[PDB]
């Protein structure tokens, strides 16, 4: 049903886990593919990180003004996986470079013997897990990696306004066309002209594999970080004819995150949620 055999002498059990937070404004869909390998030496998992994080856009008034009105944004979102375990060790992760193109589409491949890949275009290991994001206008990159995580960034990063060619820094990234206007959001682009990333939110699709010493615990447990860094964005009524003008307050709000602990068993293949934020 849910164990799928790969070669002679390996097999895969594949769980699943869901968990969403109304107070983060995140989804976490996690599978987790159970290596079972007679020629592997190791134990091995791999993780895919999906799911979805609202970018949580928001339009207001500033203070009792009626001429200043401000756009709360996500300048980057946040992706994260670590292992608190010392028999743990983070093999590989994908997307492995800083990557610009407006679809992440890569492919890990496994072939018996631990022998772990990339695809080109398609390939034919024993077993294979795909991964498929939209970035329009951001940008991938790792931040941080050891043998016990991995950290991933999706800033914004290059943009094509009215006023020409603008970096994610652009302080009149996104400011409107409708300074007599009473409502906030009209002093901003519309959501037409916005990227997907800032009108909606983020649908992350990321690998990690895992190798575990071969009865060193029957559990472990990894913590899955998704969030967000928020910018706010100005806009100010100059007044011939009356426009627009932004400033910006640079990572408002940092460290959005909801954090989600899972418990791995080796032996039984269960999943649990041992706790969130």
């Known amino acids: 049903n849910n164990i799928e055999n790969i070669g002679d002498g390996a097999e895969v059990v594949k769980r699943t886990e869901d968990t969403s937070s109304d107070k983060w404004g995140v989804t976490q869909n996690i599978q987790f593919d159970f290596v079972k390998d007679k020629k592997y030496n190791k134990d091995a998992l791999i993780l895919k990180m999906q799911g979805f994080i609202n970018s949580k856009t928001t339009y207001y008034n500033y203070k009792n003004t009626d001429h200043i009105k ?14 608190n375990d010392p028999n743990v060790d983070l093999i590989n992760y994908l997307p492995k470079n ?32 795909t991964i498929s994001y939209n970035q329009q206008n951001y940008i991938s990159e790792v931040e941080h990696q050891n043998s016990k995580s991995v950290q991933w960034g999706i800033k914004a990063n290059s943009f094509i306004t ?3 060619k603008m970096s994610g820094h652009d302080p009149n ?19 037409n002209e ?43 009524r100059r007044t011939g ?37």
């Not at 996104?174 to 901003?188: A, E, I, L």
């Not at 909801?258 to 934020?277: L, P």
């Open 70 to 83: 401000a756009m709360r944004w996500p300048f980057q979102y946040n992706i994260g996986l670590k292992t």
């Open 98 to 129: 800083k990557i610009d193109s407006v679809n992440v589409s890569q492919t890990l491949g496994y072939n018996i013997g631990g022998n772990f890949n990339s695809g080109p275009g398609n390939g034919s290991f024993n077993y294979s897990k």
């Open 162 to 164: 009215s006023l020409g």
């Open 173 to 191: 990234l996104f400011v409107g066309y409708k300074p007599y206007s009473q409502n906030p959001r009209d002093y901003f682009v519309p959501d």
């Open 194 to 236: 916005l990227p997907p990333l800032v009108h909606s939110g983020f649908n992350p699709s990321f690998i990690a594999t895992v190798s575990h010493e071969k009865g060193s615990g029957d559990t472990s447990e990894f913590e899955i970080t998704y969030g967000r860094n928020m910018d706010v964005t100005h806009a100010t």
């Open 241 to 277: 004819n009356s426009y627009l003008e932004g400033s910006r307050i640079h990572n408002a709000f940092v460290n959005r995150n909801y954090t989600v602990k899972y418990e791995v068993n080796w032996k039984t293949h269960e999943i649990k949620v041992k706790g969130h934020n």
